[PDB]
A paper describes a structure:
As expected, VmoLac is roughly globular and exhibits a (β/α)8 barrel topology that is similar to that of others PLLs such as SsoPox17, SisLac8, DrOPH3, GsP10 and GkL36.
Interestingly, VmoLac was crystallized in two different space groups. The structure that was solved in P64 reveals a homodimer in the asymmetric unit, as previously observed for other PLLs, such as SsoPox. Because of a relatively good resolution of the structures (1.8 and 2.35 Å), this unexpected density could be attributed to a fatty acid with good confidence. However, the precise nature of this fatty acid is uncertain: the number of carbon atoms is clear from the electronic density maps, but possible unsaturation is difficult to interpret from density maps. Notably, the bound fatty acid adopts a slightly different binding mode in both of the monomers, and movements of residues on the active site loop 7 can be observed (Ile229 and Tyr230). In particular, loop 8 residues Y265, V269, V270 and T273 occupy slightly altered conformations, whereas loop 7 undergoes a larger conformational displacement.
Residue numbers in the entry:
A (entry chain B): 0 to 315
B (entry chain A): 0 to 314
The structure:
């Protein structure tokens, strides 16, 4: 009767039971080819401990549900997420897609777009990685390389999988080249209702004119990297969030941290040194209190953190 | 007192016991990110049967040793190769390297070349994938995209790992853009003895003067894709191999098929339709009999299929 959302560990929830949700986080971000070939560079016990400690920190602030935006290309592992879910009791929602900024595998290029659609559709309708945990969203990615041929093919495939299954599309974009607008254009060509999409990493700018260009199209926007000052400082992100509420856009806003308890792209020392304030709790510690002090209401914070993630999954 | 070569399944051999060797083959060629995320697209039992069947086929012609050129990027799996080795009794030599034509992972780019060197050195000195099977060679790869910055880094890392460990370098190149010559240039910059290297896929051309430009540098050349007519037809490959022995180059020639019993880049029906003669035995069925017919001797075939693979590993 309702949408059914698989969560890690074998169960399903309805959108109404998501509760307070962090819509864009990670449990472990790692690179399949490196981990497959060089296991010596990794420590699964420490990775799991870090994920568990971060999710438990969020749970203390009343987070009920975390959407793990880790998909193929950045190391999605259902079985690892099952262990975090068992340990913390937080609902972990997973998805499908192919994360790349430039190229896709020969496997798919040599078979054509439908082979990639079909793999996503498999995950959504049957289950991820031989499990009964189905993908509840599809991801599309674009970054500072722009719309390469292969990047365009993967965005189109995500769009086509959404058309077949009706799961929402959660995206990653790069604000510096206006690549967010390419997602919009392709999604419209493919017939996607933009209200079932999130334009990711829009919080990495404070350019209101650019942000409202996206918002006027009807998509959700991801104010989704709070704590990554290297993309945009915290004070600018909070000022932007507050201004967009004051201009009437609350129903389109989604907040998160994009936190990676492990990320293999960089040594852990370098992450600590560069973005020491990045955690999975900074929204609760710093952002919400500042918004409340500037007149944002309790019920407006609930609309953003509860209603908006729920409606991404249900529609109107 | 001799070089020690690990082989799949825990043991070590010396170069003198390699015997008749196929120096560039594959047992399973698969894409890590795809197999990790989409296991439904694969069938390990079928992959294993195909690898066993091909290796057994070669074993019937007296092959004793196969060098698996599958490294990171094309799905190297020591445990898989252990199964094949146990079933067939053929010695399987493995290596290390990073197979790419364009990019390498952020993991390494963000840490610097020495991180990639160190990973290769780990495989050579400790072992691959948590096993006591050590990499006995290092691979460097360039193709139709030419010398990208990341390709350059991986070629240089291969060279630096060779300088530290003395294992041979076995390469992949692409003949249409003369990328083979970028390998040589970089290896010379890094101080590599080219006699300890193989310039791969040189058999994809019949341009004898180009092939000789590479030969005069002192490296081994890989006449290594017999049966891949899409790269060069069989008759042209065999004519080239005969001519190069007649000209005096035998000590630098290596023959193989590059055969992939499974390859996930293309559906199997497409492979069968396009290269229906590609197998791990075509050299024995078609190539050697034509060479013998044209005056190449029994001993010359042994020098190429036994002595040259051995000398790659001993100097
Ligand atoms: C030199 C900068 C080092 C620290 C940078 C932290 C990295 C932020 C990674 C952004 C999120 C990972 C990828 C993704 O989730 O799309
Ligand atoms: C248009 C269809 C072409 C199908 C032909 C099969 C091609 C296989 C060649 C790849 C060789 C493996 C990669 C490598 O070993 O470097
Ligand atoms: Co992202
Ligand atoms: Co993310
Ligand atoms: Co090759
Ligand atoms: Co090969």
């Amino acid at each position: 009767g309702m949408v059914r959302i698989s969560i890690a560990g074998g169960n399903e929830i309805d959108p109404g039971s998501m509760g307070l949700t962090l819509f864009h986080e990670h449990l472990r971000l790692i690179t399949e080819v490196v981990r497959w070939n060089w296991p010596h560079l990794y420590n699964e016990d420490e990775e799991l401990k870090r994920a568990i400690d971060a999710v438990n920190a969020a749970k203390k602030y009343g987070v009920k549900t975390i959407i793990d935006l880790t998909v193929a290309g950045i190391g999605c592992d259902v079985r690892f997420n099952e262990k975090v879910a068992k340990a913390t009791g937080v609902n972990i929602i997973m998805g499908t897609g192919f994360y790349t900024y430039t190229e896709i595998p020969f496997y798919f290029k040599n078979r054509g777009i439908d082979s990639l659609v079909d793999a996503f559709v498999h995950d959504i309708t049957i289950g991820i990685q031989g499990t009964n945990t189905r993908a509840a969203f599809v991801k599309a990615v674009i970054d500072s390389s722009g719309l390469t041929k292969d990047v365009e093919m993967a965005i189109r495939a995500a769009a086509k999988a959404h058309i077949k299954t009706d799961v929402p599309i959660i995206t990653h974009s790069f604000v510096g080249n206006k690549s967010s607008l390419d997602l919009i254009r392709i999604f419209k060509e493919e017939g996607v209702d933009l209200a079932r999409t999130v334009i990711g990493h829009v919080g990495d700018t404070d350019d209101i004119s650019f942000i409202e260009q996206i918002l006027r199209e009807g998509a959700f926007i991801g104010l989704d990297r709070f704590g990554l000052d290297i993309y945009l400082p915290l004070d600018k992100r909070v000022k932007t969030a507050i201004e967009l509420i004051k201009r009437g856009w609350i129903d389109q806003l989604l907040l998160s941290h994009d936190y990676c308890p492990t990320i293999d792209w960089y040594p852990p020392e370098v992450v600590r040194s560069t973005v020491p304030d990045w955690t999975m709790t900074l929204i609760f510690e710093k952002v919400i209190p500042r918004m409340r002090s500037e007149g944002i209401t309790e019920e407006q914070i609930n609309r953003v953190l509860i209603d908006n993630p729920r409606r991404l999954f249900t529609g109107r």
